[PDB]
Design a binder for this molecule. Structure first.
Ligand SMILES: [Mg+2]
Ligand SMILES: [Mg+2]
Ligand SMILES: [Mg+2]
Ligand SMILES: [Mg+2]
Ligand SMILES: [Mg+2]
Ligand SMILES: [Mg+2]
Ligand SMILES: [Mg+2]
Ligand SMILES: [Mg+2]
Ligand SMILES: [Mg+2]
Ligand SMILES: [Mg+2]
Ligand SMILES: [Mg+2]
Lengths: 124, 109, 128, 44, 223, 225
RNA sequence: GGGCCCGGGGGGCCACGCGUCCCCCGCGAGCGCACGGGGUCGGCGGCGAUGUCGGCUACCCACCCGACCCGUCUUGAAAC
RNA sequence: GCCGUCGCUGGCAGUCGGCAGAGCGAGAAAGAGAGUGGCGCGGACGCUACGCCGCGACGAGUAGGAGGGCCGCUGCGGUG
């Protein structure tokens, strides 16, 4: 279970960074890079991940499908959204709220998508 | 033109006999030799004005060597017209026995 | 024109002088690193007036501004670009410091990436 | 020292104070009226 | 709906009315005054029409945001503060200016503006101080007064009139006395000045400058 | 349907507002009654003395029932008996204040700590200003400023003490529940006397400060409260 | 004096529906001001590119107050 | 005001959202109970629970005991 798996990795993980009085987690599907039970991208049945597209255009939204929990190859569904800034967030907002897919990650996903999009603008 | 400040002397710091509280200065003001004549001065501005080597900006003027530490009179001290003053920085000990300016503002009359 | 923190409160230090070890001014063999005096007659230990001061938890810094840099950020050492992307979502409160032992070739990539992500770098102009 | 704080604790303080203010102003007037009568009587 | 009526409870002191609850109840006649129990705009388009959203969602969200503040009371903006004035500063009073380039010059008080700053005049022909604003804490009010009760000061002389106009530098930019200011100076001066000359030697007093000299101590002398 | 539930919510809120409104009138009228009571007590003693004097006799007023005790000595070098009695009075710190209801048991305790305390008989104004400026309740073993009447009502309401005026009335008149209302109050933390002291190391009658100074405690209380 | 300051024949009340039997004789609406659960201004001014602005601490120097050399045994150490 | 300790063996799993309805600080036990008859698609942060938050009191120390060190040194297994 998620709680059992958190108790094994909360302080022992190859993704754990403890430095400068700060703690970070570098695993995928962690929307804040935060060593937290809520934001851990590995232990929950459902997780939300936002990443920049392989080309610097748009974001890739990752959702964990329900069935294949023990099958890493088919576990994650990737969707590339390369619309305008407001449209991208609206898609992400709906993919979470309407589906009730981790509604508590809604703003974390939306804040991460804005940060990735803002990064892809020309550097001044 | 003419002088617009009262002549005060930086007598010393606030102290007992063997403890010195540098954040408060004791000011002797000319002509104020009773505790009841200090009421006019309470809350008035004080200015330790001095000169240095390197030029510094001057408000409303061009750079020169004048410098000032500002302060204000906070309360009377003793029975003989001394007042306690507090400055934005503690006064240097080299200023003891030297002029401190006491302004006529903030005016309460 | 540098990146600013989310907030910039006033930093208050109860003390700014370092605590120098007792008698570290009298010998070269005594370094200035603090050591709790423990002699029976030690006048520093007994807190005599006008003597060297000992550290104690009372000097502790405000939890809200502790470890905060003068710019208002908090530093986080990074050794490569991958370590830099953790600060993506805390870029208004934590800046990046590139470790000393990162070659000049690798600094440019880190410094460039941090500019894209709006992460502040404390030593961007080093090893140029 | 804070009127509205006192009323949250003792609402009757407001009545007491109003009576005092009115009683003291009323009492002050009489002393003035009684003084003027004597002064005019002395003038006579 | 009825017209507003002035408060029937005259203020005894701050926060306390003259009349009690039951006294006010009768005064208000409450015995007989008993009582018992868009976001979208549709438009045509050359689909035919669209439901337009008045306000659009943010297109960018910062990584972090600050929380709201707890609510307080009594912290009004400056424009709503109540303006105070020393009882010694009455219109026509002669004030000594303590700061600025005009420090030590004796001027004539005209009125207090809505921001609490004082309006004074030299007059310009006696000490070269024009219609100018000054702060009451930075003047000494003397006991010498003139009766300007019959002087009409223009109503357009407000805080906004005297507010500095920003000058942009890319060399410098020089303040220029507007023609309206000169006209206003003569309008006010032409009334105050004859009243100054009625008092003997008063005009010479306003030309002189205040200073502290040997043995003169402010706490000892009446102004 | 939600309209029916909302009405139930509004009606419940209305009931609480009315219960609050009626409780305000209770404490408002309680204060009005104590004011009359205090006036009658003050006027009664004067009337009693006047009639004794008229008849050529002496009216001896009742020995005071209430005392305010102040600790005026530090904590260094206190004998074991004094140290225990000062903790029982709850004067564990210098310039701490407490009310004590007087009787043979307590007057003899005050004699033991005589060199360490200044005490006397407080008047009504002293009880007022003490409890208003420096009144803290002992609620759940914590020191809570008495900034709300609900604080008093929750703890002492079972004894019908539900407002500051009831608390002042219980203390001043030494009511039947003085013990509970008084122990509820935290020891008053008073400031150093503004104007100094005469000599803390000798009795009041000797020109010092220690011991019983009777009503002269009020002059001290003004300078410390 | 006390009896909600008993009963009969100018000034303040945290009195103010009524059907009644009778001791005695459960929701009105709003609006506004604030001594009201810890500060705000919906207030301003001056200066700024080659000599000036900021830099606690740090380097040197000066001054005022404080200040005897540590470890140790010891009732007691700056200890002749 | 700030730091830490101790205490409340205190509060927070309720982020229960358009399969929605925002409360449980309040003087005084126990239900924001269940029923049967008489346009918009929106709503900050949080929660490394070994975490986060609140409130109150307190803080000298040799010999000595204990706790915590994202204090420091060298080598081994894992990991980066
Ligand atoms: Mg010893
Ligand atoms: Mg002693
Ligand atoms: Mg005094
Ligand atoms: Mg003795
Ligand atoms: Mg010396
Ligand atoms: Mg020496
Ligand atoms: Mg030895
Ligand atoms: Mg020996
Ligand atoms: Mg020794
Ligand atoms: Mg010797
Ligand atoms: Mg200790």
């Amino acid at each position: 279970s998620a709680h059992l798996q958190w108790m094994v990795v909360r302080n022992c993980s190859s993704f754990l960074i403890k430095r400068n009085k700060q703690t970070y987690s570098t695993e995928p599907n962690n929307l804040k890079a935060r060593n937290s039970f809520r934001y851990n991208g590995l232990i929950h049945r459902k997780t939300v991940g936002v990443e920049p597209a392989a080309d610097g255009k748009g974001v890739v939204v990752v959702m964990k499908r329900r069935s294949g929990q023990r099958k890493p190859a088919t576990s994650y569904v990737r969707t590339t959204i390369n619309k305008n800034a407001r449209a991208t967030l609206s898609s992400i907002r709906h993919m979470i709220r309407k589906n009730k897919y981790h509604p508590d990650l809604r703003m974390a996903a939306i804040r991460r998508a804005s940060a990735i999009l803002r990064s892809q603008k020309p550097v001044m | 033109s003419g002088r617009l400040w009262c002549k005060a002397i930086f007598a010393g710091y606030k102290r007992g006999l063997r403890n010195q509280r540098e954040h408060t200065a004791l000011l002797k003001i000319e002509g104020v030799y009773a505790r009841d004549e200090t009421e006019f001065y309470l809350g008035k501005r004080c200015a330790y004005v001095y000169k240095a080597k390197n030029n510094t900006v001057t408000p409303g003027g061009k750079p020169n060597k004048t410098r000032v530490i500002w302060g204000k009179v906070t309360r009377a001290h003793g029975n003989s017209g001394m007042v306690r003053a507090k400055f934005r920085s503690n006064l240097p000990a080299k200023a003891i026995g030297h002029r401190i300016r006491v302004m006529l503002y903030p005016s309460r009359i | 024109a540098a990146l600013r923190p989310l907030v910039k409160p006033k930093i208050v230090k109860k003390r700014t002088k370092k605590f120098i070890r007792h008698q570290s001014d009298r010998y070269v063999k005594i370094k200035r690193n603090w050591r709790k005096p423990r002699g029976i007659d030690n006048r520093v230990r007994r807190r005599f007036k006008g003597q060297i001061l000992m550290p104690n938890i009372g000097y502790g810094s405000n939890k809200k501004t502790k470890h905060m840099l003068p710019s208002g950020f908090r530093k986080f050492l990074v050794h490569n670009v991958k370590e830099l992307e953790v600060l993506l979502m805390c870029n208004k409160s934590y800046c990046a410091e590139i470790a000393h032992n990162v070659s000049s070739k690798n600094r440019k990539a880190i410094v460039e990436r941090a500019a894209q992500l709006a992460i502040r770098v404390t030593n961007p102009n080093a090893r140029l | 020292k804070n009127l509205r704080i006192m009323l949250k604790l003792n609402p009757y303080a407001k009545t007491m104070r109003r009576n005092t203010i009115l009683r003291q102003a009323r009492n002050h007037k009489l002393r003035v009226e009684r003084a003027a009568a004597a002064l005019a009587a002395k003038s006579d | 709906k009825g017209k507003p009526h002035c408060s029937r409870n005259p203020v005894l002191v701050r926060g306390i009315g003259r009349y009690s609850r039951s006294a006010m109840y009768s005064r208000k006649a409450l015995y007989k005054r008993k009582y018992a129990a868009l976001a979208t705009v549709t438009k045509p388009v050359g689909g035919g029409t669209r439901v337009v959203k008045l306000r659009k969602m943010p297109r960018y969200y910062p990584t972090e945001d600050v929380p709201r503040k707890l609510l307080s009371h009594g912290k009004k903006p400056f424009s709503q503060h109540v303006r105070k004035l020393r009882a010694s500063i009455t219109p026509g009073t002669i004030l000594i200016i303590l700061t600025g380039r005009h420090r030590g010059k004796r001027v004539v008080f005209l009125k207090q503006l809505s921001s609490g700053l004082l309006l004074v005049t030299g007059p310009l022909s006696l000490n070269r101080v024009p219609l100018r604003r000054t702060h009451q804490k930075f003047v000494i009010a003397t006991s010498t007064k003139i009766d300007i009760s019959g002087v009409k000061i223009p109503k357009h002389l407000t805080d906004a009139y005297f507010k500095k106009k920003k000058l942009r530098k890319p060399e410098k930019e020089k303040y220029e006395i507007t023609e309206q200011r000169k006209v206003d100076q003569k309008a006010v001066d032409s009334q105050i000045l004859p009243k100054i000359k009625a008092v003997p030697q008063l005009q010479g007093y306003l030309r002189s400058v205040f200073a502290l000299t040997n043995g003169v101590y402010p706490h000892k002398l009446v102004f | 349907n939600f309209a029916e539930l909302k009405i139930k919510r509004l009606r419940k809120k209305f009931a609480q507002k009315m219960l609050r409104k009626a409780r305000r009138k209770l404490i408002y009228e309680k204060a009005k009654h104590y004011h009359k009571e205090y006036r009658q007590m003050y006027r009664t003693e004067i009337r009693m003395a006047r009639m004794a004097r008229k008849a050529g006799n002496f009216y001896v007023p009742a020995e005071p029932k209430l005392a305010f005790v102040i600790r005026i000595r530090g904590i260094n070098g206190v004998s074991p008996k004094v140290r225990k009695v000062l903790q029982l009075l709850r004067l564990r710190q210098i310039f701490n204040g407490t009310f004590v209801k007087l009787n043979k048991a307590s007057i003899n305790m005050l004699r033991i700590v005589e060199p360490y305390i200044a005490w006397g008989y407080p008047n009504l104004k002293s009880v007022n200003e003490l409890i208003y400026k420096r009144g803290y309740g002992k609620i759940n073993k914590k020191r809570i400023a008495l900034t709300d009447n609900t604080l008093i009502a929750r703890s002492l309401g079972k004894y019908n003490i539900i407002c500051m005026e009831d608390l002042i009335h219980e203390i001043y008149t030494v009511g039947k529940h003085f013990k509970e209302a008084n122990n509820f109050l935290w020891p008053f933390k008073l400031s150093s006397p503004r104007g100094g002291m005469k000599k803390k190391t000798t009795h009041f009658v000797e020109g010092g400060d220690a011991g019983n100074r009777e009503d002269q405690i009020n002059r001290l209380i003004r300078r410390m409260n």
